[PDB]
Design a binder for this molecule. Structure first.
Ligand SMILES: [Zn+2]
Lengths: 80, 299
C-alpha cells in the first residue's frame, strides 16, 4: 500500500579518467553507507552511477569538486 | 513467453511446478531451502542422467538485479520447452538452475523499494538484510565487505548466516563432485568474470576458465555485436571476499566458476523496460549456451 519515497533523490554519473580517480570513488562508497552506488568498476571510460539522498547531495558533490572528478546529474528527480 | 515481463516469486515457482508436471521425464523440481520469511527456494533439474557433467546456474541473489532471474527463466524455457533446439547442451550436460536465490529481497524490491539489494533477515536492532554475495565462507570478511549491519555490502553476522546462501551451498554440494560449471548471473555491466573475487593473484587454472568465458563473449559478439569484457574479477571490480563464485571454485571444487554481469537498461541499468527483456535474455542465452557447450566439450 505504501512504498519508499525517492522524492528529491538524484542520480549522478561519474567517469573517472585514471585508476586513481576511480579509487577515490571506491573510498567514498566504502566510507559512506548512506550513498547507494548503482555501478562502480575499474573499466576505463565506464560511468559510475550513484543514487544520493537530499541530505547527502551537497556533501557528495563537494567531495567530487574536491577531487577534480567530472560528474553529471543524470536523474534530477527520481520522483518518489 | 516468460520474456515479456518480470515475474513475481510465486509466478516463478508456479512456472517451475507446471514444467515438473508437463515434462516428468525431463524435469524435476525440488526445494533447496526456505528463505528467512518462509518462501520456497526451488531449483529445476534438467536432463538428469548418470555420469553427466552438471551445470549449476543461479540468479537473483541481489534483489534489484531483475534481468538475472529473467535470463535464468529464459534459459529454463529454452532447455525444457525448446529442447530440440538445444541438444548440443543436453547430451552429456545436466542443468540445475536456481532462478531466484533471494526471494525475500526480490519481492521487497517489487513491493517497497526497487533498489533494495540484500536479504531481509534482521541483523540487529537497526536494519535488515545481508549481502548474500559477501556471505559465502571462503576468505569471508577479509576484504571489500562492510562490517556495518546496515550497509548494502554487509557481510552478515557470520559466513552463511543467510538461509538463502546456505541453500546455494547445499544445492551445489548435493551434486557430489559432478558439477563442472558454476555460473552466477548478476547485473549490470556486460562482464564475464571469474575468480578470484577476493584477490588479484590469478588462480592456477585461470586459462581453462578464460577459455570458457571467451567462448561466451565471442558467441554474443557474433550474434548481436555486443561487446563483453572477460577476465578475472579484480581486472574489472574492486576486490571483495565472500562471493559465490570464489566459494564454488575453492570449496565445492567446481573447475569452471563464472559470474556474468548482464546488460543494463532503463534509467538505472538494473531496470530495463519490460519491452527490452526479450532481446537481452535472447542475447544472454547465446553466451550462456556457448559457455556450456565449451564445458560439454571439455568434460
Ligand atoms: Zn549482483
Amino acid at each position: 500500500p505504501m512504498r519508499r519515497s525517492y522524492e528529491g533523490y538524484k542520480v549522478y554519473g561519474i567517469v573517472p579518467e585514471s585508476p586513481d580517480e576511480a579509487e577515490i570513488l571506491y573510498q567514498i562508497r566504502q566510507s559512506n553507507p548512506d550513498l547507494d552506488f548503482w555501478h562502480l568498476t575499474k573499466q576505463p571510460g565506464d560511468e559510475a552511477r550513484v543514487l544520493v539522498a537530499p541530505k547527502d547531495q551537497r556533501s557528495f558533490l563537494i567531495k567530487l569538486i574536491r577531487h577534480g572528478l567530472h560528474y553529471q546529474e543524470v536523474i534530477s528527480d527520481v520522483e518518489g | 513467453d516468460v520474456s515479456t515481463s518480470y515475474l513475481r516469486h510465486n509466478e516463478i515457482n508456479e512456472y517451475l511446478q507446471t514444467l515438473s508436471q508437463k515434462y516428468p521425464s525431463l524435469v524435476s523440481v525440488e526445494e533447496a531451502g526456505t528463505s528467512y520469511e518462509g518462501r520456497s527456494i526451488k531449483t529445476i533439474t534438467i536432463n538428469k542422467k548418470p555420469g553427466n557433467a552438471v551445470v549449476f546456474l543461479d540468479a537473483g541473489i541481489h534483489a534489484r538485479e531483475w534481468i538475472a532471474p529473467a535470463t535464468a527463466l529464459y534459459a529454463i524455457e529454452q532447455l525444457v520447452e525448446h529442447s530440440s533446439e538445444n541438444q548440443e547442451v543436453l547430451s552429456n550436460l545436466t542443468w540445475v538452475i536456481m532462478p531466484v536465490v533471494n526471494p525475500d529481497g526480490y519481492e521487497f524490491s517489487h513491493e517497497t523499494d526497487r533498489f533494495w539489494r540484500k536479504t531481509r533477515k534482521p541483523t540487529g536492532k537497526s536494519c535488515k538484510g545481508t549481502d548474500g554475495n559477501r556471505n559465502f565462507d571462503y576468505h569471508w570478511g577479509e576484504v571489500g565487505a562492510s562490517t556495518q549491519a546496515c550497509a548494502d555490502t554487509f557481510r552478515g553476522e557470520t559466513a552463511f548466516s543467510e538461509p538463502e546462501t546456505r541453500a546455494v551451498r547445499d544445492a551445489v554440494m548435493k551434486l557430489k563432485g559432478s558439477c563442472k560449471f558454476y555460473l552466477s548471473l548478476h547485473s549490470y555491466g556486460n562482464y564475464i568474470l571469474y575468480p578470484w573475487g577476493w584477490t588479484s593473484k590469478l588462480p592456477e587454472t585461470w586459462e581453462a576458465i578464460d577459455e570458457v568465458a571467451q567462448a561466451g563473449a565471442e558467441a554474443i559478439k557474433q550474434s548481436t555485436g555486443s561487446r563483453y569484457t572477460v577476465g578475472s574479477s579484480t581486472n574489472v571490480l574492486y576486490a571483495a571476499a565472500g562471493g559465490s563464485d570464489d566459494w564454488a571454485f575453492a570449496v565445492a571444487e567446481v573447475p569452471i566458476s563464472i559470474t556474468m554481469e548482464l546488460p543494463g537498461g532503463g534509467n538505472g541499468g538494473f531496470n530495463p523496460p519490460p519491452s527490452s527483456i526479450e532481446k537481452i535474455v535472447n542475447e544472454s542465452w547465446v553466451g550462456i549456451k556457448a559457455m556450456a557447450l565449451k564445458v560439454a566439450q571439455m568434460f
